[PDB]
Design an enzyme around this catalytic site. Structure first.
Site, PDB file in Angstrom:
ATOM      1  N   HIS A 188       0.772  -1.161   0.050  1.00 25.13           N
ATOM      2  CA  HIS A 188       0.130  -0.180  -0.022  1.00 25.13           C
ATOM      3  C   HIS A 188       0.721   0.967  -0.054  1.00 25.13           C
ATOM      4  O   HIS A 188       0.229   2.609   0.017  1.00 25.13           O
ATOM      5  CB  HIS A 188      -1.070   0.096   0.872  1.00 25.13           C
ATOM      6  CG  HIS A 188      -0.472   0.287   2.461  1.00 25.13           C
ATOM      7  ND1 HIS A 188      -0.335  -0.954   3.322  1.00 25.13           N
ATOM      8  CD2 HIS A 188      -0.084   1.272   3.313  1.00 25.13           C
ATOM      9  CE1 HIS A 188       0.068  -0.587   4.477  1.00 25.13           C
ATOM     10  NE2 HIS A 188       0.427   0.704   4.650  1.00 25.13           N
TER      11      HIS A 188
ATOM     12  N   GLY B 254       3.269   5.878  10.100  1.00 27.87           N
ATOM     13  CA  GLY B 254       4.418   5.851   9.857  1.00 27.87           C
ATOM     14  C   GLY B 254       5.101   4.607  10.042  1.00 27.87           C
ATOM     15  O   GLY B 254       6.269   4.074   9.671  1.00 27.87           O
TER      16      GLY B 254
ATOM     17  N   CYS C 235       4.126   1.251   9.398  1.00 24.46           N
ATOM     18  CA  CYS C 235       3.971   0.271   8.412  1.00 24.46           C
ATOM     19  C   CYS C 235       5.478  -0.124   7.978  1.00 24.46           C
ATOM     20  O   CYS C 235       6.467   0.786   7.802  1.00 24.46           O
ATOM     21  CB  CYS C 235       3.227   0.629   7.209  1.00 24.46           C
ATOM     22  SG  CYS C 235       1.374   0.972   8.034  1.00 24.46           S
TER      23      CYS C 235
HETATM   24  C1  LIG Z   1       1.163   2.480   7.993  1.00 29.33           C
HETATM   25  O1  LIG Z   1       2.328   3.343   8.802  1.00 29.33           O
HETATM   26  C2  LIG Z   1      -0.241   2.787   8.985  1.00 29.33           C
HETATM   27  C3  LIG Z   1      -0.295   2.165  10.300  1.00 29.33           C
HETATM   28  C4  LIG Z   1      -1.169   2.286  11.120  1.00 29.33           C
HETATM   29  C5  LIG Z   1      -1.724   4.031  11.453  1.00 29.33           C
HETATM   30  C6  LIG Z   1      -1.892   3.894  12.786  1.00 29.33           C
HETATM   31  N1  LIG Z   1      -1.761   2.767  13.610  1.00 29.33           N
HETATM   32  C7  LIG Z   1      -1.285   1.767  12.580  1.00 29.33           C
HETATM   33  O2  LIG Z   1      -0.605   0.751  12.801  1.00 29.33           O
HETATM   34  N2  LIG Z   1      -1.048   1.982   8.202  1.00 29.33           N
HETATM   35  C8  LIG Z   1      -2.343   2.932   8.059  1.00 29.33           C
HETATM   36  O3  LIG Z   1      -2.446   3.906   8.066  1.00 29.33           O
HETATM   37  C9  LIG Z   1      -3.259   1.931   6.832  1.00 29.33           C
HETATM   38  C10 LIG Z   1      -3.114   2.354   5.495  1.00 29.33           C
HETATM   39  C11 LIG Z   1      -3.904   1.750   4.347  1.00 29.33           C
HETATM   40  C12 LIG Z   1      -3.899   0.151   4.722  1.00 29.33           C
HETATM   41  C13 LIG Z   1      -4.877  -0.521   3.808  1.00 29.33           C
HETATM   42  C14 LIG Z   1      -4.758  -0.088   2.407  1.00 29.33           C
HETATM   43  C15 LIG Z   1      -4.593   1.101   2.131  1.00 29.33           C
HETATM   44  C16 LIG Z   1      -3.757   1.840   3.072  1.00 29.33           C
HETATM   45  N3  LIG Z   1      -4.661   2.355   7.529  1.00 29.33           N
HETATM   46  C17 LIG Z   1      -4.966   2.018   8.709  1.00 29.33           C
HETATM   47  O4  LIG Z   1      -4.303   1.198   9.427  1.00 29.33           O
HETATM   48  C18 LIG Z   1      -6.456   2.173   9.136  1.00 29.33           C
HETATM   49  N4  LIG Z   1      -7.313   1.005   9.106  1.00 29.33           N
HETATM   50  C19 LIG Z   1      -8.195   0.499   8.264  1.00 29.33           C
HETATM   51  O5  LIG Z   1      -8.470   1.240   7.252  1.00 29.33           O
HETATM   52  O6  LIG Z   1      -8.781  -0.545   8.565  1.00 29.33           O
HETATM   53  C20 LIG Z   1     -10.076  -0.939   7.871  1.00 29.33           C
HETATM   54  C21 LIG Z   1     -11.226  -0.265   8.371  1.00 29.33           C
HETATM   55  C22 LIG Z   1     -11.704   0.767   7.444  1.00 29.33           C
HETATM   56  C23 LIG Z   1     -12.764   1.688   7.962  1.00 29.33           C
HETATM   57  C24 LIG Z   1     -13.384   1.338   9.337  1.00 29.33           C
HETATM   58  C25 LIG Z   1     -12.943   0.128  10.087  1.00 29.33           C
HETATM   59  C26 LIG Z   1     -11.971  -0.684   9.593  1.00 29.33           C
HETATM   60  C27 LIG Z   1      -6.292   3.024  10.258  1.00 29.33           C
HETATM   61  C28 LIG Z   1      -5.236   4.188  10.131  1.00 29.33           C
HETATM   62  O7  LIG Z   1      -7.698   3.623  10.472  1.00 29.33           O
HETATM   63  C29 LIG Z   1      -8.262   3.477  11.796  1.00 29.33           C
HETATM   64  C30 LIG Z   1      -7.240   3.867  13.025  1.00 29.33           C
HETATM   65  C31 LIG Z   1      -9.515   4.655  11.867  1.00 29.33           C
HETATM   66  C32 LIG Z   1      -8.906   2.055  12.153  1.00 29.33           C
END
Ligand SMILES: *[C@H](O)[C@H](C[C@@H]1CCNC1=O)NC(=O)[C@H](CC1CCCCC1)NC(=O)[C@@H](NC(=O)OCc1ccccc1)[C@@H](C)OC(C)(C)C
Ligand SMILES: *[C@H](O)[C@H](C[C@@H]1CCNC1=O)NC(=O)[C@H](CC1CCCCC1)NC(=O)[C@@H](NC(=O)OCc1ccccc1)[C@@H](C)OC(C)(C)C
Lengths: 306, 306
Positions: free
Chosen positions: B41, B143, B145
């Site tokens: 991603h 950050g 990831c």
């Molecule tokens: C990478 O550095 C980050 C690490 C996260 C950020 C905060 N804590 C972490 O461990 N990863 C992300 O930010 C990812 C990025 C996406 C991953 C999927 C493909 C596109 C990029 N996003 C998330 O981690 C979000 N979670 C999520 O979308 O889960 C599915 C979902 C969506 C909507 C409702 C319920 C579930 C996080 C940042 O969003 C929430 C904290 C709001 C869950």
């Protein structure tokens, strides 16, 4: 989010660990520049241990009595001196992996990472606090002496602990890297006990802020309290007095969460008086006191280290 | 003695961490030989995140879209491929710090150390378990990831986790190093939830053995139980079924303490039915389930790593 008992990355310290053998004793040493630091009881024999006079013991030693092993490399001792309870072995090679470092003597309540080692080889890393009674609740077996505790500040390793001994309650005692014991302990195998410990109040409050930063809010209340009135409650539950300087240190966390320090104090006061009643905070059913305010800010904002 | 939540020394992994920037996304990559592994991603934009087609997204990329920073050294991408949910960037330089390593996909209940990183720089190390619902209870901010989880076996680093995302309960999801998610999760920003978790029974039993090895015996009893009768109790308290293979794994610990596995099971059964009643085990007021039997044996006998 989330909150874990987090140690510093241990690579900079692992590159300093060596094996030091003298007589029938093997333990760990810390190799920085051309000096190896290790506990002076490495020169004691299985019967010197009761009331050793280390000055006499050391003057009877020659450099070639000290076997220093750095991996697959035997290091030559060219000199030795004693500083308080640590031995310093001058070796003919500077450690090329020597990080930027400092030796610091920490205050009770401060935390650090311990790199547990045996025969010069790292076994594991974990986070500790200097308890108010100057013991640490570590995980240490025979051969672990000379393992060090440390903090990392950007690129600089601050060494603050070297392991020397285990007390009868299962907790641990040792020195700073200049060989001064934390607490009233002495390296000599005579009866010693830790002394009554207390809970590190300012750290419990920082962890309650960590909890709020992470979505736990069930323990909060509308009440406030005075520092005086809080400390009367703390005493009764064997908590360190909370000083005004503690309150100031907790300022950033207070400002980031919008909860005045004395309000968190009212929360802690009720947690002490009612318990948690089947609830947990940050995955704990106990009030956790081995996170400093700096620990909380570091982990909840993502500070790194070069 | 003592018993701590102990991570592996992180030096071998720290020497592999790099920064990977693409577009407006920065995250971490793992640099082994001439390849950098990171979450795919990294190629998503702030609006691709809802239903991305990564094959289309990646075919539109050129190597020079990938900024790889290894300390003060900019690494040149000479090729890229996608494997499941991880991107592999071929770079022109082999990492000279590459340790001996393996990629392993772990089973639920197994533990590992996580090296939390930001912008290629390590922030901290901690121990995790793969939960039965294939989430980990980590500590991860934006950050993070591309941070990896790993075990060390003598000299070999077994990588088992790469961080990708945070779920709404505050727990974490990611993949093995070949890019296959643990659990039913997908990298795409649509509604997903962890699923009901359960307690890792065999690990609770190993930790009860750790406690006995360390002098806690107050929870023991004279009773025994059958595996069948134990598992009826486990179910009711949301514990993993204990298999006969679990019982076999617990054999060394049983033999070292003289407590038959099914006797420890009778102890756990009473702990579940009566609680702990103001007592602690190994400093915990909860039954701890993130130590495997191997973790207990390693820490209680002092295994190291070259
Ligand atoms: C990478 O550095 C980050 C690490 C996260 C950020 C905060 N804590 C972490 O461990 N990863 C992300 O930010 C990812 C990025 C996406 C991953 C999927 C493909 C596109 C990029 N996003 C998330 O981690 C979000 N979670 C999520 O979308 O889960 C599915 C979902 C969506 C909507 C409702 C319920 C579930 C996080 C940042 O969003 C929430 C904290 C709001 C869950
Ligand atoms: C060095 O590798 C070990 C590390 C210990 C061993 C197990 N856990 C550890 O952390 N250090 C020792 O073995 C030291 C060695 C002596 C230190 C003093 C000077 C001479 C060498 N010994 C101990 O740690 C013992 N503790 C101790 O003697 O404390 C004082 C005492 C004596 C008698 C009664 C009460 C208190 C340990 C090994 O003994 C007990 C575990 C029985 C406390």
């Amino acid at each position: 989010s989330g909150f874990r008992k987090m140690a510093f990355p241990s690579g900079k310290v692992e590159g300093c660990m060596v094996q030091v053998t003298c007589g029938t004793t093997t333990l760990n040493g810390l190799w920085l520049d051309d000096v190896v630091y290790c506990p002076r009881h490495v020169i004691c024999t299985s019967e010197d241990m009761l009331n050793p006079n280390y000055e006499d013991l050391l003057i009877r030693k020659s450099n070639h009595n000290f076997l220093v092993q750095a991996g697959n490399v035997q290091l030559r001792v060219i000199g030795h001196s004693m500083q308080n309870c640590v031995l310093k072995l001058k070796v003919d090679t500077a450690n090329p992996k020597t990080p930027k470092y400092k030796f610091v003597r920490i205050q009770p309540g401060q935390t650090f990472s311990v790199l547990a080692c045996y025969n010069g080889s790292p076994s594991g890393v974990y986070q500790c606090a200097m308890r108010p009674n100057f013991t640490i609740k570590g995980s240490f077996l025979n051969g672990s002496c000379g393992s060090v505790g440390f903090n990392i500040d950007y690129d600089c390793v601050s060494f603050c602990y070297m392991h020397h001994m285990e007390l009868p309650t299962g907790v641990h005692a040792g020195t700073d890297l200049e060989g001064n014991f934390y607490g009233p302990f002495v390296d000599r195998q005579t009866a010693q006990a830790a002394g009554t410990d207390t809970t590190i109040t300012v750290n419990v409050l920082a962890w309650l802020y960590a909890a709020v930063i992470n979505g736990d809010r069930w323990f909060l209340n509308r009440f406030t309290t005075t520092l005086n009135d809080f400390n009367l409650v703390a005493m009764k539950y064997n908590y360190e007095p909370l000083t005004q300087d503690h309150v100031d240190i907790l300022g950033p966390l207070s400002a980031q969460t919008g909860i005045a320090v004395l309000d968190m104090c009212a929360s802690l006061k009720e947690l002490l008086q009612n318990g948690m009643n089947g609830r947990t905070i940050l995955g704990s059913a106990l009030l956790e006191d081995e996170f400093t305010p700096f620990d909380v800010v570091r982990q909840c904002s993502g500070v790194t280290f070069q």
